[PDB]
Design a protein around this ligand. Sequence first.
Ligand SMILES: Cc1ccncc1CO
Length: 165
Amino acid sequence: SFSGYLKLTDNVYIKNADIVEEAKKVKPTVVVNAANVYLKHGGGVAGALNKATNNAMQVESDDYIATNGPLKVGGSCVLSGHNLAKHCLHVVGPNVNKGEDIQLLKSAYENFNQHEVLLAPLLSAGIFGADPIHSLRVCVDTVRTNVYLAVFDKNLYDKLVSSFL
Ligand SMILES: Cc1ccncc1CO
């Protein structure tokens, strides 16, 4: 199971870890991807998870988009977890670097409530441009299921834990 996590609340846990290495170790039922509406996994967490699947995540995602069209910002879809997890929950948080509504971050986290346990990154953090402290607050105040957050950056992990209210 998940090991080395710091408990923040009844259901939210956090660890300074690479989510790809964490997924390969745990093989969780659900790994969350920090997706965009087109499921184009170029960089950030998405680029890293896709590279770990040898691009199989991108091939599956292109077929999904060809059939269904783009996701909504704040929305999600369940696809295969490939070699990382049973499933990948592709969740689109708002990208503030694309001028998207930060208010959609709560809607994005609501997708996590459809899964009893998830391994996830902080939505809209990193290259999505939102304040990770704000993302963690929205996570704890929105997600009711068991979420194990992997924060890649050690300095950011320390700042998140030390400032957690
Ligand atoms: C977690 C992560 C995010 C972006 N790039 C690389 C990594 C490591 O796999």
